Structure formats: structure tokens, C-alpha cells
Amino acid sequence: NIQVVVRCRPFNLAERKASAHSIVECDPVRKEVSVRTGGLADKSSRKTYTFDMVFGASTKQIDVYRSVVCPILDEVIMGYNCTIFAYGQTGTGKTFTMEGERSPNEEYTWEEDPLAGIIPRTLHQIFEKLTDNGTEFSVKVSLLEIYNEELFDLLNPSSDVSERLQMFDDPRNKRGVIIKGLEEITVHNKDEVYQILEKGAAKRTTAATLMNAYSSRSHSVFSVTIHMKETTIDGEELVKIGKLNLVDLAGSENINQSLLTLGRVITALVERTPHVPYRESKLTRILQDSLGGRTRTSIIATISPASLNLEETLSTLEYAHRAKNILNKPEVN
């Protein structure tokens, strides 16, 4: 049973300039989201949905991390494979939540930036939790992006972001794949983190100037792999592996093969259709095990609070709510 949560961003300055009204109410306690749907015609009308967790407009980055990620990171350290992906309309906060942003000027260090998202906070915790705990461990990260069914490597040594990756079925996993050419960087300590992310963002910036509407049409896949040593009571040394995939999806409002097959894959699972079209898109092949497989999965549905985005917001809520019916069978590696 996959976890689905909703995060509503606060109004932006443009919306206030236009006197935007709010049509969203979040109730963390009852874990519900209620939408005002009749504007001027019917003031009482509304659509209420129930999710595993709800975060209102005032929710801060650190709140999302403590509530959603902490539990997931524990599962990863326990030797599980987990996936968190953001789904939502362009401009609602997918990237802001998954990666976050850097505060202007010095002001804050990357480890203390209030605006930092899930990726930076997670990599920081991995080193903090595992170091102040003993345990021999090694951390490896990768960041690829899908655009028009083509795969680009943001952490690759080559200076040209357009050099393409390839995908193949993983011989040792019926529902897993191998990314040929992918650069998996070993992160020796937290002091090596920021440089890797900074290089990553730089190559992404170059890619957005190379392809049309890159930022909103692409899918971003960040993966973290942890190898940890365990010694049984008998003195046997073995290695448990934990893996975390942090995915920032293309805008739902929508080169659309992956987003399209994703919806198709979800529908097939909730309706129990015989054949699930995983093979039909680069995205669903990478996430196959996350959708009905052995990976612990959580979805963060992002929405705007404005009356103007009513239709899309309802669409996002409806889509994410169906997703609650997808069942997975988590299994340690």
C-alpha cells in the first residue's frame, strides 16, 4: 500500500497582485484537503479528499523532511529500496520540495539553508546518522534526466550534457534495469556533497537552453545507494544495501510518453488489468519495482491554492487519490 501525501504551496507575488482567492483548505489532523469548487455560483460546494498526510501553505521544508522522509530513510538504512516522487502541475512545487533552493548571498551554508529540499537534507542525514553510530558504510549517488524519452547524465565527467545514456534489462532482477554509461559518484563524506549537486545543477542549466521547455517536460531521477556492514551474533560479516530514489516528474498539465505511460501503469494496477505497460516508457521501466513491486513508495502531490488553477488541482488530487490503491510488497535486499 503506497503512501500518498499532499503539499500546497503558498500564494506567490503575481497571484497576490491579481487578488487571487484561495480555494484550498488543508486539515493536517483529519489529513484532508478540501477544495472550493463553485466560485460565484455555489458558495457551499466543495470536494474533500483524504490522504496519508496533508501539508498546508505554511508548511516549511524541514517539516516535510521530518514527517515524510525520516521514516523512509530508516527503511533504507534497514536494507530496503524506497522511492519518493513528486507529482503536480508546473509551478506547484515539485522541484522546490524534492531539491529545494539556495538562499541568496552568503546568509546560510548549504547544511543550514531553510530552503533546502529533500535531496540535500537526506544526503546530510545519511552521513550524520551513520557516522555517529559506527557502522562501516559507503555512499554512492547518481542523477539522470528523461526528456523526450532520451536519457541525460547530469553528474557525468563529459562536458556535453547531450551525450545520451542507454537502458537495458538487469539480468539479476526481473523488474529492474541498468543504465549504461551512467556516472555513479562515491561520496566519501558530507563535505563532498555540495560540489556534486552544484555541478549537477550547472549541467541542467545548460540543458534547459538546449531543449524546448526542458524544465517542465523533463523527469529528474536522483538515486542514493548505501552499502552498510553488519556482523551477525556468530561473527559473520555481510553487506546490507539500501537504495533511495527521489523523482521529480514532468508537469502533470502535459515528449509525453513517460508521463502518459505512468498514468496508464497506475490505472492498470488499480483496475487489476492483466498486462501492466511498464515497458512502454523509459520512466516506467526505471520505476517498475516502485509501482506494484518490492519497493516502499511515497507520492507527494503538489498543488496551488489559487482559484485560477481549480481544474488542474482537482485533477492532481484525483490522480493521487487513486494511487493510494496501488499495493507494493516491500522486501529487503
Ligand X SMILES: Nc1ncnc2c1ncn2[C@@H]1O[C@H](COP(=O)(O)OP(=O)(O)O)[C@@H](O)[C@H]1O
Ligand Y SMILES: N[C@@H](CSC(c1ccccc1)(c1ccccc1)c1ccccc1)C(=O)O
Binding-site positions for ATP read 88-95
Least gap, CB of 300 to Mg ion (angstroms): 13
- Choosing from 23, 54, 99, 320, the residue that interacts with ligand Y (CB under 6 A) is 99
- Residue closer to ligand X by CB (options 88, 120) is 88
Least gap, CB of 129 to ligand X (angstroms): 26
Does residue 153 interact with ligand Y by CB under 6 A?
no
Instruction: Using CB atoms within 10 Å of the CB of residue 315, give its burial: 0 to 12 exposed, 13 to 18 middle, 19+ buried.
Output: middle
Choosing among Mg ion, ligand X, ligand Y, none, which partner's interface includes residue 99 (Cβ < 5 to 8 Å by kind)?
ligand Y
Angstrom distance (rounded) from CA 302 to CA 14: 19
Least gap, CB of 79 to Mg ion (angstroms): 31
- Choosing from 18, 201, 210, 308, the residue that interacts with ligand Y (CB under 6 A) is 201
- Residue closer to ligand X by CB (options 59, 225) is 59
- Choosing from 116, 139, 165, 323, the residue that interacts with ligand Y (CB under 6 A) is 116
Choosing among ligand Y, Mg ion, ligand X, none, which partner's interface includes residue 160 (Cβ < 5 to 8 Å by kind)?
none
Least gap, CB of 256 to ligand X (angstroms): 16
Unique residue bearing C-alpha cell 519518493: 84
The three cell numbers locating residue 50: 483524504
- Choosing from 25, 32, 75, 113, the residue that interacts with ligand Y (CB under 6 A) is 113
Q: How many CA atoms lie within 13 A of 287 on its CB side?
A: 32
Choosing among ligand Y, Mg ion, ligand X, none, which partner's interface includes residue 116 (Cβ < 5 to 8 Å by kind)?
ligand Y
- Residue closer to Mg ion by CB (options 95, 307) is 95
Choosing among ligand Y, Mg ion, ligand X, none, which partner's interface includes residue 302 (Cβ < 5 to 8 Å by kind)?
ligand X
Tell me the three-class secondary structure of the chain, residue by residue. Answer: CCEEEEEECCCCHHHHHCCCCECEEEECCCCEEEEECCCCCCCCCEEEEECCEEECCCCCHHHHHHHHHHHHHHHHHCCCEEEEEEEECCCCCHHHHHCECCCCCCCCCCCCCCCECHHHHHHHHHHHHHHCCCCCEEEEEEEEEEECCEEEECCCCCCCCCCEEEEEECCCCCCCEEEECCCCEEECCHHHHHHHHHHHHHHHHHHHCCCCCHHHHCEEEEEEEEEEEEECCCCCEEEEEEEEEEEECCCCCCCCHHHHHHHHHHHHHHCCCCCCCHHHCHHHHHCHHHCCCCCEEEEEEEECCEHHHHHHHHHHHHHHHHHCCCCCCCCCC
What is the per-residue burial (b if ≥16 Cβ within 10 Å, else e) of 12-36?
eeebeeeebeebbbbeeeeeebbbb
Does residue 73 interact with ligand Y by CB under 6 A?
no
Does residue 100 interact with ligand Y by CB under 6 A?
yes
- In the stretch 77-106, what mask flags binding to Mg ion with x, by CB under 5 A? ------------------x-----------
Query: Which residues contact ligand X by CB under 6 A?
Result: 9-10, 88, 90-96, 302
* Residues that contact ligand Y, how many (by CB under 6 A): 14
- Residue closer to ligand Y by CB (options 190, 240) is 190
Q: Which stretch binds ligand Y (CB under 6 A): 42-50, 110-118, 166-174, 272-280?
A: 110-118
Q: Which stretch binds ligand Y (CB under 6 A): 19-27, 51-59, 196-204, 225-233?
A: 196-204
Q: Which residues bind Mg ion (CB under 5 A)?
A: 95
Q: Which residues bind ligand Y (CB under 6 A)?
A: 95, 99-102, 110, 113, 116, 119-120, 197-198, 200-201
